[PDB]
Amino acid sequence: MQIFVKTLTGKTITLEVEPSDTIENVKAKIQDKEGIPPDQQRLIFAGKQLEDGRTLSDYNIQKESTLHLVLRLRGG
Template sequence: MVSQADNLLSCKRVRTLTGKEIELDIENEYKVAQIKEKVEEKEGIPPVQQRLIHGGKQMTDDKTAADYNLVAGDTLHLVLALRGGC
């Protein structure tokens, strides 16, 4: 049996381009889209404007924290999505 504590990744950090760090508690089964929603709650940035980077690669919304082997203390990097057009 897996306890809830085993599923929780405490003190996950998201660093913005300005260097500000946001601490989030996320669970292994959280999808990247859910992590973006948590960032929106703290920073007010809509998920569609967010790109999360881990290990130099952009994270995909439909994958989970476990899919990326995230562990407590990891830092994700938040960049804003650029919109195309003139």
């Protein structure tokens, strides 16, 4: 199943998921693709932050939804 993540600076990242992947699964995939720790990452869609224990289903993600990966400096 296709999702995309776009950055805060620029560029897009290409992702194969499953509807049942947890939001931690996206960030660990992404942590392979470009070495960004899940502790740096916030994800946003539709004016909400995506908390790490929920699925692509819970947050109503349809196929090919481009997503906005945002960043900490360090914390919170």
